């Protein structure tokens, strides 16, 4: 054409890198094959899952908690699953259409089709309309993302053997559902359907669910899931075989064998980096054994002028805000500015109820690294707001360097953990000590006071516990 930058992939990583590059003055194009912008996150990930977790949480509260507050008739509330899915699609549509508008507003040229490398500076676009085009550019950002990991002996058919995409689109509540993989995606998607009536069983190979989190955190979460959603957990369990019977699945597991039968199986064991059809081999962009594109500190691949960000790269966790910050940083670097991402401060949130939010290091990691640390913990059953509205589950746990009082990690389990973690992120970005946070005035009554007091438990004593 020629372009200054061509971004392949329109997910959180690519659409943000595209807008930021355009804003910085670069002639930018974004190639996306799906037919809609927003990538995995907006279309079949972040957004539809949070939309269904919200609607189902309202439903659960009406049935389980309304009476405690004086509300009668909650038992009469039912969920029209077709209308529920329709609102979810409406929400997704509002966001994906919004990104197209931002592209127009920022003058990003949008190509609908699959992008492939011809050379490090020429990209072939196989248009969705059949037409082919060759893009010439100075720089290219690979933001092709990831896809669900399939079990080789039980391929997805998105009818009974489901990936997260199929599970988000079920037209009716399954009677029974088994979830393989007790990670963030399995727990969120299992909660959606368990709230509406499905008998859900989670099968996890590790000793406990969300193995990346400390045991006191996952304990608080699984205890709530077992009590409220009535989910059943089978940890230290391996899946050894299975059969797709067309309208049900038979799974064989072992902890001693056993067979489980379910109407719907959600396989959420992991996600793998996706570079299919990209032509990386043609230009020799290096990948590690897991298939991730290898990058350096400035997002550069092994090939000059070709960069990569988001889920496809060998750095950081596979999360949307990580891809978004890498997109901004990469665009800034391409414009001659000093961009960078702080990989030591990337939060992770589980939108179950209660929610779980973490940033920084876990105790398991500090123990592994031999760091001497102090723990400040404040339970929500002692917090003013949580007691006032009767949603007392969870706690805030702050880990500090026993020598310098610096905050090393913050973990929160409570109804509003996702929004509380932003304060902890800013604290860590700044290298704050527990005393810095503890001496800041927090509004009363708020759940953020539990963060203030857990910090006070580190450098002094908490007041309300």
Helix (H, G, I), strand (E, B) or coil at 422: helix
The interface partner of residue 95, options being a second copy, ligand FAD, none and the CB cut-off 5 to 8 Å by kind, is a second copy
Single out the segment in contact with a second copy by CB under 8 A; choices: 54-62, 206-214, 229-237, 306-314: 54-62
Judged by CB under 8 A, the number of residues near a second copy is 96
CB 187 within 8 A of CB 202: yes
CB 214 within 8 A of CB 182: no
Active site residue 298: no
Catalogue the E-assigned strands of 248-297: 249-254, 257-262, 264-267, 271-273
Q: Which 8-state DSSP code applies to residue 109?
A: E
The interface partner of residue 54, options being a second copy, ligand FAD, none and the CB cut-off 5 to 8 Å by kind, is a second copy
CA atoms within 13 A on the CB side of 350: 31
How many whole angstroms separate alpha carbon 253 and alpha carbon 270? 18
Tell me: does residue 73 bind a second copy (CB under 8 A).
yes
Give least dist CB 44 to a second copy, A.
13
Tell me: does residue 353 bind ligand FAD (CB under 6 A).
no
How many whole angstroms separate alpha carbon 73 and alpha carbon 66? 8
Single out the segment in contact with ligand FAD by CB under 6 A; choices: 30-38, 234-242, 291-299, 399-407: 30-38
Give least dist CB 12 to a second copy, A.
7
How many whole angstroms separate alpha carbon 433 and alpha carbon 435? 5
Tell me: does residue 323 bind ligand FAD (CB under 6 A).
yes
The interface partner of residue 87, options being a second copy, ligand FAD, none and the CB cut-off 5 to 8 Å by kind, is a second copy
How many whole angstroms separate alpha carbon 19 and alpha carbon 1? 19
Would you say 450 is a known binding-site residue?
A: no
CB 242 within 8 A of CB 154: yes
> In the block, which residue shows the tokens 């997910």?
11
Catalogue the E-assigned strands of 143-195: 146-148, 161-162, 176-180
- Residues 419-458 touching a second copy, rule: CB under 8 A, are 419-423, 425-427, 429-430, 432, 436-437, 439-449, 451-452
304, containing H or E segment:
none
* Interior angle at CA 328, CA 323 and CA 333, nearest 5: 120
355, containing H or E segment:
strand 355-360
Tell me: does residue 12 bind ligand FAD (CB under 6 A).
yes
The interface partner of residue 182, options being ligand FAD, a second copy, none and the CB cut-off 5 to 8 Å by kind, is none
Tell me: does residue 278 bind ligand FAD (CB under 6 A).
yes
Q: How many CB atoms lie within 10 A of CB 348?
A: 18
β pairing state of 28-32 and 3-8: parallel
In the complex with ligand FAD, which residue's Cβ is closer, 143 or 456? Answer: 143
> In the block, which residue shows the tokens 């908690």?
65
Helix (H, G, I), strand (E, B) or coil at 111: strand
The interface partner of residue 8, options being ligand FAD, a second copy, none and the CB cut-off 5 to 8 Å by kind, is ligand FAD
User: 142 has which bridge partners?
Assistant: 8, 308
Tell me: does residue 372 bind a second copy (CB under 8 A).
no
Give least dist CB 447 to a second copy, A.
6
How many whole angstroms separate alpha carbon 63 and alpha carbon 83? 19
Would you say 208 is a known binding-site residue?
A: no
Query: Of the candidates 26, 55, 320, 428, which one interacts with ligand FAD according to CB under 6 A?
Result: 320
Query: Of the candidates 23, 24, 27, 34, which one interacts with ligand FAD according to CB under 6 A?
Result: 34
- Residues 168-187 touching ligand FAD, rule: CB under 6 A, are 185
Using only C-alpha atoms, the chain has a radius of gyration, in whole angstroms, of 23
In the complex with ligand FAD, which residue's Cβ is closer, 132 or 243? Answer: 132
Which pair of tokens denotes residue 275? 């570079």
Query: Of the candidates 6, 11, 329, 449, which one interacts with ligand FAD according to CB under 6 A?
Result: 11
- Residues 181-240 touching a second copy, rule: CB under 8 A, are none
Tell me: does residue 13 bind ligand FAD (CB under 6 A).
yes
Tell me: does residue 126 bind a second copy (CB under 8 A).
no
The interface partner of residue 228, options being a second copy, ligand FAD, none and the CB cut-off 5 to 8 Å by kind, is none
The interface partner of residue 440, options being ligand FAD, a second copy, none and the CB cut-off 5 to 8 Å by kind, is a second copy
* Interior angle at CA 78, CA 72 and CA 82, nearest 5: 155
414, containing H or E segment:
strand 407-414
Tell me: does residue 388 bind a second copy (CB under 8 A).
yes
Residue tagged active-site, from 60, 63, 121, 444: 444
List interacting residues with ligand FAD (CB under 6 A). 8-14, 31-34, 39-41, 45-46, 49-50, 114-115, 143-146, 164, 185, 274, 277-278, 310-311, 318-321, 323, 444-445
Catalytic residue ranges: 444
- Residues annotated as binding site for NAD(+)? 181-188, 204, 239, 270
């Amino acid at each position: 054409n020629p372009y200054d930058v061509v971004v392949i992939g329109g997910g959180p990583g690519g659409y943000v890198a595209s807008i930021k590059a355009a804003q910085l003055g670069m002639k930018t194009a974004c190639v996306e094959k799906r037919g809609a912008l927003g990538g995995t996150c907006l279309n079949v990930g972040c957004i539809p899952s949070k939309a269904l977790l919200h609607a189902t949480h309202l439903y659960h509260d009406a049935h389980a908690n309304f009476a405690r507050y004086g509300l009668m008739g909650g038992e009469g509330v039912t969920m029209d699953s077709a209308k529920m899915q329709q609102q979810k699609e409406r929400a997704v549509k509002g966001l994906t259409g919004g990104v197209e508008y931002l592209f127009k507003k920022n003058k990003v040229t949008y190509y609908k089709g699959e992008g492939s490398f011809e050379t490090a500076h020429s990209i072939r676009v196989n248009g969705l309309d059949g037409k082919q085009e060759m893009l010439e550019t100075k720089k290219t950002i690979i933001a092709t993302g990831s896809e669900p990991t399939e079990l080789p002996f039980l391929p997805f058919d998105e009818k009974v053997v489901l990936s997260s995409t199929g599970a988000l689109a079920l037209p009716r509540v399954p009677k029974t559902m088994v979830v393989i993989g007790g990670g963030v995606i399995g727990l969120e998607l299992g909660s959606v359907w368990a709230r509406l009536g499905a008998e859900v069983t989670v099968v996890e190979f590790a000793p406990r669910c969300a193995p990346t989190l400390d045991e006191d955190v996952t304990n608080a979460l699984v205890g709530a899931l077992a009590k409220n959603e009535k989910m059943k957990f089978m940890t230290s369990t391996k899946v050894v075989g299975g059969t797709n019977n067309g309208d049900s699945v038979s799974l064989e597991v072992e902890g001693k064998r056993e067979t489980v039968t379910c109407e719907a199986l959600l396989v959420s064991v992991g996600r793998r980096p996706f570079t299919g059809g990209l032509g990386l081999d043609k230009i020799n962009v290096a990948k590690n054994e897991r298939g991730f594109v290898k990058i350096g500190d400035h997002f550069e691949t092994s090939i000059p002028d070709v960069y990569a960000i988001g889920d496809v790269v060998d750095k950081g966790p596979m999360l949307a805000h990580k891809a978004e910050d890498e997109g901004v940083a990469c665009a800034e670097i391409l414009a001659g500015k000093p961009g960078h991402v702080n990989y030591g401060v990337i939060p992770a949130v589980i939108y179950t109820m209660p929610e779980v939010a973490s940033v920084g290091k876990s105790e398991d990691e500090l123990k592994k690294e031999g760091v001497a640390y102090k723990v400040g913990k404040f339970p929500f059953n002692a917090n003013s707001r949580a007691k006032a509205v009767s949603t007392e589950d969870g706690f805030v746990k702050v880990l500090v360097d026993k020598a310098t009082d610096r905050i090393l990690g913050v973990h929160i389990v409570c109804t509003t953990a996702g929004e509380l973690i932003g304060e902890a992120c800013l604290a860590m970005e700044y290298g704050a000590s527990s005393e810095d946070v503890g001496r800041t005035c927090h509004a009363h009554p708020t759940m953020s006071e539990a963060l203030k007091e857990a910090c006070m438990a580190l450098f002094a004593k908490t007041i309300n516990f």
